[PDB]
Amino acid sequence: SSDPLVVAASIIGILHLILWILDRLFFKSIYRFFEHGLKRG
Amino acid sequence: SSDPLVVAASIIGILHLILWILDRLFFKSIYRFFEHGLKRG
Amino acid sequence: SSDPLVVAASIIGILHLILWILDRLFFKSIYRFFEHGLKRG
Amino acid sequence: SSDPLVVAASIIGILHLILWILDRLFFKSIYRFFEHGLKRG
Numbered sequence: 001s002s003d004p005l006v007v008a009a010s011i012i013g014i015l016h017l018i019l020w021i022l023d024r025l026f027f028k029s030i031y032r033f034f035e036h037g038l039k040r041g
Numbered sequence: 042s043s044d045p046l047v048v049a050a051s052i053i054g055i056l057h058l059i060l061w062i063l064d065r066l067f068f069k070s071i072y073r074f075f076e077h078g079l080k081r082g
Numbered sequence: 083s084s085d086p087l088v089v090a091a092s093i094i095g096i097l098h099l100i101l102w103i104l105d106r107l108f109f110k111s112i113y114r115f116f117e118h119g120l121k122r123g
Numbered sequence: 124s125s126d127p128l129v130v131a132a133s134i135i136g137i138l139h140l141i142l143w144i145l146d147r148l149f150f151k152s153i154y155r156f157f158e159h160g161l162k163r164g
Binding site for chain 4: 003006007010011013014016017020024025027028
C-alpha cells in the first residue's frame with residue numbers, strides 16, 4: 001500500500017519514546033535546548 | 042484490515058512528534074491554544 | 083502478523099494525540115484523575 | 124516486508140501511553156527517579 005510512510009512513522013514512534021526517556025535521563029540537553037528556545041523566542 | 046485508518050494513524054504519529062518539537066521550539070503558538078482552553082473550559 | 087493488535091495499537095496512537103489535545107483544551111477532566119491519584123497514594 | 128519492526132513499534136506506541144498514565148497515577152515512582160537524577164547530575 002504506502003509501505004515507506006507507514007514504516008517511517010512507526011520508526012518515528014519508537015524515536016519519540018527514546019526522546020522522552022532522554023528528556024529525563026539526560027535532562028541537561030533539553031535544559032540547554034529549552035533555554036535556547038526561550039531566548040530566541 | 043482496510044487501509045485508511047492505519048495509514049491516517051501513522052501519519053498522526055509523526056504529526057505528534059512534530060508537534061512536541063513545535064511546542065519547545067516555538068513556545069508561543071501552543072501557549073495561545075492552552076490559554077484558549079483555560080478561558081473556555 | 084494478524085490485524086487486531088496493530089489496528090488497536092494504531093487507533094491507540096491517534097488516541098494519545100487526542101488525549102494530549104484534551105489535556106490542554108479540557109483541563110478540568112485530567113484534574114479529577116490526578117487528584118484521585120494524589121489522594122490515595 | 125517488515126512485520127517484526129512494524130509490530131514492535133506499534134506495541135511501543137501503546138507502551139508510551141501506559142507510561143504517561145503511570146506518571147500521574149503512581150506519582151511517587153517519578154518522585155524516586157527524579158530525585159536520583161537531580162542528586163547524581
